[PDB]
Amino acid sequence: NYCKRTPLYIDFKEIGWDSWIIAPPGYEAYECRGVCNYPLAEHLTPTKHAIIQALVHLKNSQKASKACCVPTKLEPISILYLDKGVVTYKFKYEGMAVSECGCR
């Protein structure tokens, strides 16, 4: 119901990504489930457009769509994979795991 850091463990064997991703077998990427309702809290890192869009949808839901609960900050993780057939280890594969959720 609320825009929160809902847990979401992932396993690459389920999505067939074991072809290129050597390790790890999985990780806790989490997700941002919930909805964004006006007024938007400052702890959800809202935007100037998100504040206006929430007010417009409050007046007329058909005029504008709702703000959405989406990740705002994404932490990196160390992975080992094959990049074009080359065994590559990236200690900081940025954009994988979520650390902060919010509305946009």
Partner 1 sequence: DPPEYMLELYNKFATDRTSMPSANIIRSFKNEDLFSQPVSFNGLRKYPLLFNVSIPHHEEVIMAELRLYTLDRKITIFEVLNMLVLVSGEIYGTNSEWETFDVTDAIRRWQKSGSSTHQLEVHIENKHNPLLIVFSDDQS
State yes or no: residue 16 binds ligand NAG (CB under 6 A): no
- Cα(89)–Cα(29) distance, integer angstroms: 19
Nearest-approach distance from CB 67 to a second copy, in angstroms: 8
Among 5, 80, 96, 100, binds partner 1 (CB under 8 A): 80
User: How far apart, in whole angstroms, are the C-alpha atoms of residue 31 and residue 100?
Assistant: 9
Output the six-digit token pair for 45: 């890192």
87 binds ligand NAG (CB under 6 A): no
Least Cβ distance, residue 84 to ligand NAG (angstroms): 6
d(CA 72, CA 18): 28
State which of residues 14, 84, 87, 91 lies at the interface with ligand NAG (CB under 6 A): 84
The distance of closest approach from Cβ of residue 61 to partner 1 in the complex, given in angstroms and rounded to an integer, is 32
Q: What is the DSSP letter of 35?
A: B
| Interface with ligand NAG (CB under 6 A) | 84-85
